[PDB]
Every structure is written in C-alpha cells, then in structure tokens.
Amino acid sequence: PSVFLFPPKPKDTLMISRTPEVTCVVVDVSHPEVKFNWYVDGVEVHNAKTKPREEQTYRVVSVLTVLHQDWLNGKEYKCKVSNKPIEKTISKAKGQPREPQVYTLPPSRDELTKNQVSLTCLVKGFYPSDIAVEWESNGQPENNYKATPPVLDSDGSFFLYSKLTVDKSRWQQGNVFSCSVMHEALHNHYTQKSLSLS
Amino acid sequence: GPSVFLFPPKPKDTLMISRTPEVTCVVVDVSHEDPEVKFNWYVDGVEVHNAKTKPREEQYNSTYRVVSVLTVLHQDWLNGKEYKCKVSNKALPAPIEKTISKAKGQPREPQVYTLPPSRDELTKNQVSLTCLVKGFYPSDIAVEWESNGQPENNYKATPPVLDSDGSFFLYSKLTVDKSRWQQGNVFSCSVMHEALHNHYTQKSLSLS
Ligand SMILES: *[C@@H]1O[C@H](CO)[C@@H](O)[C@H](O)[C@H]1NC(C)=O
C-alpha cells in the first residue's frame, strides 16, 4: 500500500569518502514478497541492494548507492514497487545554488537565570535545502543539540536554526563552541563559526 | 480500498477567538463506482450534526478524496474533548471510526527569548531578529512579530521541534532593514499558547 522514497544524507553527498544512498521504503506488506525496479534519469540499474525484512505487516527497504556527482548534477532516481505498482521519484531541487550564511547567536540575558542556556546557530540564504549542521567544543561533538528542518524563506532560499543546549557554568567559564555547516555552495563544502562569552 | 485520516485544527485557529478551528476527516481512495460517503461525528460520544461536507475532489487515477469538516469550540479542544469520525461507504464491510484529541500530557509554559542579530550580519542591508520559544507543551503555538502597533511584513517561524526533555521548541526569524534596527526601533515577539497566563506573552528587542 504505502511507499516512501528518501534522499541521501547531506553529509554523505558532500564528503567524497562517505557513500551516499537513496532509500526506497515500502511499508504495510502482506504475509508477501516485493519487486524493486530502479531508474536513473529513466534508465534501469540493477546494483541496488535489498535489506532484510522488518516486522510491523512487514517493512521492506531497498538501498541504491548514488554517485556523488550524479546527485549534485541532479539526476532523477525512480523507485518502482510491484506487489499483489507504485512509482516514486526524488532529486536535488533545480535552481541556482546559494551559499549559506552562518551566524552564531549567544543566549538571551534572560536565559542566564536557568541551569542551562541555549546557543543558537542561524544558517540562511542557502539553496538547495540539503544541509548538515553540527556543534562541537574542544574538538569534540556536543551531547545535546538539535536543528529545525529547513524552512523556505520569502526570497526562495532556505534557512534553519540549530539550538545547542549547555550547562550555564560551561558557557560562563569562557569555553568556545563552534557551529559547523556542510553544504555544496560552500568552498570545500565546509564552514565553521565560533561563539564564546564576550 | 478507502482509507480514513483525521486531522486536528491548525494551531493558530485554536488560539485566536476570531478564527475557526476545525477537525478534518479525510477519506482517500474512494472509488468512482461507489463515491458516496456517510459521515457521523461525535464529541465525547454524543452525535453532533453541524459538520460540513466538502465537494469531493477526484484523483486523476479515477478515485475521489472526500472531506468533512467539524468546527470545534475553542474551549472544548482546550479541555481535552475527543472528536470521533465514523465513515460509511458501499465498499466498506464495516464503518470506520477514528478519534482525535489535543495531545495528552502535562502542559508546559513557553520560555520566550529574543535574540539580536549577530555582529557579522550587520555587514548586510537586512538583518535577522530571532525569537527562541522553548520549554513548551503541547506543540500548538503561534508566534508573530510587531512594532509600534503594526504587525511585521517579513517573518517566518520554523515548525515546532521535539526537544530532548519531551518539550517542544521553535524559532521565529524576522527580517528588517538594517536601518530600522540601527535606529533603536523596538520589535516585539508575541506568543500565544494555552499554558501562558491569558494564553499570551510578548517579548521585546532593540539596540541594547
Ligand atoms: C490516487 O492518487 C492519490 C493522490 O496521490 C493517492 O493518494 C491514492 O492512493 C491513489 N489511488 C489509487 C492509485 O488507487
């Protein structure tokens, strides 16, 4: 009945050493088997790997490795599911890519009454939405941060915010935190900004 | 065969007295052959009759999407009333029932923090004022911006995101001419949520 076709992880398409994949997820299957057909700009490929079956009905996932440049150039990946057929497609959005602007914002004066404070990373003006944002300090990832999903801005670019939560004492001490952003329009697909008490 | 989805009211509708919150019952994959759907609606088990039936809209794969809309009293949504949709159709062997209500769980008041633009952005012709709303439950909220009495043209909120303590947060970005910011003009983030006193709080932001 139901088919979902996810794109590759942003970080996996921008680092050459990682391996980006398109995942075609079928759910709500009978007790049973399913046929996958895969196409790249209309042309069938047979290198996709089907994962083991996953219960509750049954969930079946097929994973196709994509070439980094095929995705960034924006080839279409089409998944066809046949069973006792539904087609789904995905692709990097068309349009002039745009460099993200990364701004780190310290916590509000008001938040300093709380045991934990929020450090905020604003990433805006970027296209397409595919992006990866991470927090770290002293060359180590932080335990507790989350980002919003990308949101479409009025100019047709995307933005998002990443909220890092830390113990106040750690911020008041003078520790430096850094928001790392990875995106295709960035030189080296990578930029970092820092933020510390001052 | 046909499937049934029941949607809650848009959050801004449940929080403003001038707006019309409604629960929406959506039946998809209704056939061309038997396109007739009977809706029954109940609130805490009592049948109600004021629901509105929308014209069916055909999916060009020769099926219909069929929708019924029940307007809800702001206070009943707020107090935890269950809304029930029962759907009947020739294709179905038994009618299908779905129940929806406001999210259960101890309500929590939003903390509201306005943040100025980063130094770096003052480079630009427009700058971003930011309103961080965190700590809140349930997720239904409304965040708006204004100054000097008027609402602001150019802003957008993220959706609410589930934080790690089981509360929600979200951010609202307001964009303004750098000039307006430099000049000391005062901007206010407003926030409407059930757990706030009078369901409303307001926080300001200027050159500080
Ligand atoms: C027809 O199209 C709609 C719209 O995408 C889809 O939700 C529905 O499942 C389809 N029904 C079919 C193919 O019978």
Author numbering:
A (entry chain A): 238 to 268, 271 to 295, 299 to 326, 331 to 444
B (entry chain B): 237 to 444
Paste lines from the article.
The ability of an antibody to recruit the killing machinery of the cellular immune system is dependent on the interaction between the antibody Fc domain and Fc receptors found on cells such as macrophages and natural killer cells. The binding of Fc to Fcγ receptors (FcγR) bridge the adaptive and innate immune systems and is a primary focus of therapeutic monoclonal antibody (mAb) research. The strength of Fc:FcγR interaction is also highly dependent on the presence and composition of the dynamic N-linked glycans attached to Asn297 of both of the Cγ2 domains of the IgG Fc homodimer. Notably, secreted endoglycosidases are able to cleave the core GlcNAcβ1 → 4GlcNAc linkage of the Fc glycan, release IgG from cellular FcγRs and abrogate Fc-mediated effector function.
To elucidate the molecular basis of IgG deactivation by endoglycosidases, we deglycosylated IgG1 Fc to a single GlcNAc moeity and determined its structure by X-ray crystallographic analysis to a resolution of 2.5 Å. Comparison of this FcGlcNAc with known glycosylated IgG Fc structures reveals that endoglycosidase cleavage induces an inward movement of the Cγ2 domains coupled with a rotation around the central axis. This structural transformation displaces equivalent Cα atoms by up to 8 Å. Similarly, displacement of the C'E loop in our FcGlcNAc structure provides a plausible explanation for the altered hydrogen/deuterium exchange kinetics reported in this region following deglycosylation. We also note that mutations able to restore functionality to aglycosylated antibodies include residues in the C'E loop. The change in conformation seen in our FcGlcNAc structure also offers a structural basis for natural immune evasion by a common human pathogen. EndoS (endoglycosidase S), from Streptomyces pyogenes, deglycosylates human IgG and decreases FcγR binding of antibacterial antibodies, an observation confirmed here for FcγRIIIa.
